[model samples]
Target chain A: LGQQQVTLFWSGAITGPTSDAGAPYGAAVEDYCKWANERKLVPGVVFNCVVRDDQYNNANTQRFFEEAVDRFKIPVFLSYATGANLQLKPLIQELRIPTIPASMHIELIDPPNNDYIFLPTTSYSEQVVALLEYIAREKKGAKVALVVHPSPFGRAPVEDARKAARELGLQIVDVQEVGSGNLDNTALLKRFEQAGVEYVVHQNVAGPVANILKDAKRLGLKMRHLGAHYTGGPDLIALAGDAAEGFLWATSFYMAHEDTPGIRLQKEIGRKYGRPENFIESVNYTNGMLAAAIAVEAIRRAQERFKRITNETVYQAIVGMNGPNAFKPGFAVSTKQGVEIDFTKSEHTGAEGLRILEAKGGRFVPVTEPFTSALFRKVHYG
Target chain B: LGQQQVTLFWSGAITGPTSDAGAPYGAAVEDYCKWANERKLVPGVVFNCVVRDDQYNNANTQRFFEEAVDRFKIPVFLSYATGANLQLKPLIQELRIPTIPASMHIELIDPPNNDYIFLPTTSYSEQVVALLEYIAREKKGAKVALVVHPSPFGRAPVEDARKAARELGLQIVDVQEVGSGNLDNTALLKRFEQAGVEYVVHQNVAGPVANILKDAKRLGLKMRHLGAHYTGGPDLIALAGDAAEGFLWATSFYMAHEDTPGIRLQKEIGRKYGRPENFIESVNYTNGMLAAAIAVEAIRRAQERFKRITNETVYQAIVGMNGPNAFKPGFAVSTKQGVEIDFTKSEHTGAEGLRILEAKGGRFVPVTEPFTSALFRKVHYG
Candidate 1:
């Protein structure tokens, strides 16, 4: 809508204040934008995107959000930082910007009443629910422990886990909250072991989950360990060495190319960039690719509907990104992996379900079919 | 939306199915509507609500939902039925109806993407989260058992409890998924007792909760019992006799109106109708009162914004129902009890928080302050 281009403003905490955790995610989206620009998928619609950092700080995020909306006039954008989105939800809604966000924290979607946001995968709650469902189906009444980040991020899936555990007749022996960055969690692991927890699901990042695995091995706590989406990255394996070997984590995006077409495209794109080996951000390139794939649908639909793409017309197109053409499976690219999306009923989830993986000799081995809980499809209660 | 002779449609399984578990709720809301009609709260909005039956059947609920929207054209109303709402979500949104639901199932709110729903409380998940929080603060990581509705309804909050238990250093030794209306649970009690559970949270209706208490007393398990909103009422104490004496449950509305103006008004209205002894429904009248109180905000706001109150306008009202005035504090009709709601961020929860009550000497004893969780405030992560 401005200066011969469909300008976009994207923000993340890739190199923000707290740590360098999200910098790669930021870069992934940026690199994908570059790919889209170079490919010229949308003729006559040149795209310009600004990828900025907020450093996981609320004050900085607020300032950045205002600048993007007020100065840049970007109608569609996104953030991988969940805490910032929560803080700025009202503003985003007031501004009526449609966002594709990271961190599908359960709270963001509950009450399912917000309209300015959409998600690419199952929520954190659903991820943990799938974990409990897997356990309940595999081991009847097995005692489990859910270890999460100490903040609301950790607690996001707690309720869903409670719901899933009871439904599956599984016992949650203990739930532990610890800092996501600390390495010394032997005391917490000991308490869990004392309760005879048969399984431990870590719903945090790879770094802290790595520490738990290291201590679990040291303390001889022979329990099954799992992690949520953010926890499945390669960092844990690198950090904990052999300890991460059997750890399973729920992932919706790609784990590896495994000779897939999308992987080839990813590397091809990477060659163009030449600076793609950002480890954490490396895996996120697929996410960046998917984001572009999804965003293209909106732009295409906007052009079809409005003839010329106004932001409102573009925003309106988001809800109609459905059918086989729009929803590419495994990856967001055509002729890649296969997953379909239905957006007719105001659905915001772009991915169909989750892919759970267990770490094995230097790789994550697929252990279960793509799982989605009955509760995930719809909210339930007595 | 109503006018001089506005007729509304209301449907639930009150007497439709499941042994009258929700009949009290049906009557309570009905009675409150009568009070509103008599008081003339909404100008020229005379009302008629068809409290029809769906027999807890989807086909019937589907017909009724269509009848309410397509047939009678009632735009803003809701049900307590979790299952029916799940089936009706797409239809309801497509039809553009504004509903105030009883079941705050996290899914309805999560993905936080839906547009038509407005909830009376946080959710079943948050209700039990508070229970676990209390256990952690009071009993110092007690061995707790969560006894829930045998169906999916009961397990919604179980995962959250596990998450809360872990953070609080508590142990959920036994997760009992019991029938919503069964009594022969001696074996369940024995298993829980064998595990040395210190407290049990009953996430079901009063009737089933009462049975658990009776069987627990018979087995001499000696574990403290608690419940969510659906598990509390004067009927619970009567059902379990001495067994119900010390049971605790979460309530945002009053269990009884002692020294409160709302109580006097309720009784006065009841005496006029000569129906003061809907004993079970009397306590639920507070819920009815709050529902009406919150609904009126939407109605009034919709009126203020537009010349005619459409469903969309009313739904728009829900997001702005914040502050001291719009979100009237606890006890809808009096300046007593305390809870606050903040809808500045698309929170459909009409009531702010819940209060914990312990049954003692045939009365609910106040046990804690109005509680809110950090997780409920926003979607947070590390």
Candidate 2:
């Protein structure tokens, strides 16, 4: 009975492995629907779920974006992929529809064009500060090593590390660069051992990290290891074993240690779906729900403002109303022009908030209170 | 005015970039001293912090353990390294004194023996179950691959993965083994790509994961990546960058997301010590606090039972009191003859306490609620 005809559009790598990347966008869709139904925000308003399987390919992503805009008539669009989102930049600008891109690429908002686009997550610079703060405080006087891949994403951390290390008075002993899929362990291990690096930080994924740990152990290099937020997954532990021991990382959420009221409600929803308690499932569901929360709130505001369900009125109401700050603190509408038209511009990246955690014995535990990055608050509209 | 005679012992790689490993342990010493002084657990009981650098060596661990026992008359021992604990096994068995191992090895508790050793943390098996359940229910038909180090610690996850794959009817397409400090990425990456693996899980620490991701990207292999808990450190992300994008792993503690009362207390302690918020630091502080908690609880129980404080009486009291579970559910205690005591015998590792999160734009967002493995209750421990 609680059906809203408002069409919501979501585009991501949804039909793939349930890793952290694709899970949230999928979760956002599911949670939005559930939240709408539960809150009775829209009765008989048909919600549309449009999923795109990018297959980790840029071309597939571009096609999906076109389909969502041209074919589906999706009023609101949400995307979660770097390549795909980048491809849709022009479309986002032309349509003047609120779009949320999950990638951290600051280039997307360059020149302050495309006001329809919003990023709810932090930027690379903020992440760099957070990472440096963590390392400086956790491993004081420890030499820092950078073993990174040569990608735009990889470069971000390296640049930040260099800056952070200098500011914190930490030594950057070695900056090892390797090609993708062609790691030279003999050389890197020798360098690490020679440097006597007791604690190592990895900038790669599960496979390379596993390989490095094995090599480090063989070289008798027993050091405390730390990883980034992307490294927070169970598969790595299953693959790394004792080498994975004493590994520490920073993250936004962990399904194993959540004790919040929102999390409790999400868990109940997961149970209803016959899904065991899992972080990705819960996140996907919650993302969907939170999105729904924002949409419902906007609709309610629209009703108050226009007394009708016209797209133009709803859009005006959404743009006029404050965004998803109902669930978070210190949240405000983005002033970016085209994106400034609605709450979607304010809370587009699908991240309602952020937190840090660590991995020990195959589970995550919280280490800091969730903090919103300054980047999320500093959106500049054209 | 608040001083207590206490000894703090640590066996971790404290030199080099990995120095962050010992940061928490060190902070814990500071935190406990402060906490005790605030609470007056013992009038004029001044804390004596004694740290031994195991240098990540098993042999050095033995020496440290002997000294802590014979030289210091230390009633409480805290170990941060697995190798150190393994080396100190003999001493722990002989002394029968209460000790808390911060990073617990699941193997130590399988047959569950020594009543003297306690771990406030959960085990790895519980973590595997939590991960597998999520993978099976949400990401059906997702191909899995493993890149592991060939060590006892590295092998642990392999065994679990094998067992879990069978249990969940999942396919293990590729299992690439790399030696410690001697990874050959060309061979491993080819196998991963050839296997058409959707998710690549790595167990290596240091630079191997970064190398692999870089190589994989260069080779144009597209796959979702997951890392072990160890790979989620600051250094890893700094080095890996875009290659580290969409990477996911499971962990026990992360410092950037703590919102619990206990974690809040720990964070305050870290700040007091001029340390940044981090998982390792928080864990160390938590472990130290828990050690004190157990010790004081045991002492109080002993006083009630025997009207005095004796080592034997305190030990007996601890064994009888059911340890830390005095506050939480889903945890029980049991004892054996020689090895380790099970404080939470029925507890399903920290998997029941883990949450799933995603790293978008350098920040982590909670994607799922904490969950336990559905099969956790079905499994039996010998």
A1-382: candidate 2 lDDT, tens digit per residue? 2434565666554322222345444544555565555656565465554544443445656666677667776655666655556667777777666665545545565544556665544444445446556677776776777765444444545655666667676777887755333333767777776787755665544546655665565566766666654444453454455566666654444343455555565666555433323432433344444444555555566656655554455456545644433323112122222121234444434343345555567665556666654432332221
- Over A55-99, each residue of candidate 1 has an lDDT whose tens digit, in order, gives 455666677778877777775776666777777777767777777
Segments in model 2 whose C-alpha atoms lie over 4 Å from true places:
A1-382, B1-4, B16-41, B83-90, B176-187, B204-220, B233-239, B276-352, B376-382
TM-scores of all candidate predictions against the true structure: 0.48, 0.44
Q: Write the per-residue lDDT of candidate 2 for residues B1-382, one digit (tens) a residue.
A: 5433555555554321123334445446545565655665554454455654443455656777777767777666666555556555666767866666655456554433455666555454555545555677857766788776454444555666667767777787887766433323667777776777777776645345765765576577777766554444443554455666666655444334545555566666556544433432333345455554555555556656776555577666655654442432111111122111223424313212544455556544455655444564344232
TM-score of chain A of each: 0.90, 0.72
Q: Give DockQ for candidates 1 onward, in order.
A: 0.01, 0.01
Tens digit of per-residue lDDT, candidate 1, span B1-382: 5365444455664432232245455555566677678887667677676655454555666777776676566758766667767667777778767776656666665543367776776578777877777777778969998888765567777767777677778898988777543526767888887789989998876767877886787676778888887787676765566778888888676556465555666666555543424432345555655565566666766776775667777777777766554665345221235435445446656665677888888778778766666653332221
Best by lDDT: 1
Q: What share of the true interface contacts does candidate 1 keep?
A: 0.00
Residue B58 lDDT, candidate 2, scale 0-100: 59
Q: How far is candidate 1 from the true structure (C-alpha RMSD, Å)?
A: 21.9
Chain A of candidate 1 compared with the true chain A, TM-score:
0.90
Q: Is the docking of candidate 2 incorrect, acceptable, medium or high quality?
A: incorrect
